Amino acid sequence: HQAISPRTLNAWVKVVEEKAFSPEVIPMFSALSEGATPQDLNTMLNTVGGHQAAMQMLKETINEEAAEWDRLHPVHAGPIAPGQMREPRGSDIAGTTSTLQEQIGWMTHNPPIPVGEIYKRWIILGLNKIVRMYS
Amino acid sequence: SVLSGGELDKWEKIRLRPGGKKQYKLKHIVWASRELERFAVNPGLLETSEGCRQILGQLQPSLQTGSEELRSLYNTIAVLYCVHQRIDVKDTKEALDKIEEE
């Protein structure tokens, strides 16, 4: 496993430097986070400089989507089949309380819990709100 | 902030060139933060070894063009990184050399 690359991050801040939460940021966010783990996605978000209010908004986002995931995805009671992974909560999909190893384990499972794709969805939803505000 | 009082006294000892007279000031941190922000890169990354390391990896490719647009930034951040990492360095070159072999 290789983490998101230095050049990918350059491509990602180049988008932001030039486009900055115009509609175009979203498809490039989406293509650049290709195969990203929740840990990659937070490395992306933590790289953005210069847009402090937008990043706050986005994180606030994040949190709403995480609280909601947990409401709609109640955990099943009593210990699980041969240690084959706890179910991820919102804070785990968001890479806050999960481990790279956990993130990958979910991601590669049969069948797969795509915790990167789910996280990317919440970020895209937050970026849609930012674009709507700044247009 | 970026440097602790202790880090700061280290920083301010360090020379731009080996045996040179000019040494690193607080101004170079400030300058490096403003530059990072211009490129939409989070200056908060300067606060830790891991963040400095991140950014060194990002800047490296540009240095391979033959552009020198990001050379002082790179040099300032290489020094920072050594400071964060407790690597004694008397000058920029000594810093680049430690970053060389890592």
From Swiss-Prot, chain A:
Residues modified to Phosphoserine: 5
Compartments where found: Virion
Coiled-coil intervals, chain numbering: none
Site feature (Cis/trans isomerization of proline peptide bond) residues: 78-79
Region entry Interaction with human PPIA/CYPA and NUP153, spans: 46-84
PTM note: Phosphorylated possibly by host MAPK1; this phosphorylation is necessary for Pin1-mediated virion uncoating.
Function as written in the Swiss-Prot or TrEMBL entry: Forms the conical core that encapsulates the genomic RNA-nucleocapsid complex in the virion. Most core are conical, with only 7% tubular. The core is constituted by capsid protein hexamer subunits. The core is disassembled soon after virion entry. Host restriction factors such as TRIM5-alpha or TRIMCyp bind retroviral capsids and cause premature capsid disassembly, leading to blocks in reverse transcription. Capsid restriction by TRIM5 is one of the factors which restricts HIV-1 to the human species. Host PIN1 apparently facilitates the virion uncoating.
Subunit structure: Homodimer; the homodimer further multimerizes as homohexamers or homopentamers. Interacts with human PPIA/CYPA; This interaction stabilizes the capsid. Interacts with human NUP153. Interacts with host PDZD8; this interaction stabilizes the capsid. Interacts with monkey TRIM5; this interaction destabilizes the capsid.
Name this protein carries in UniProt: Capsid protein p24
Origin species: Human immunodeficiency virus type 1 group M subtype B (isolate NY5)
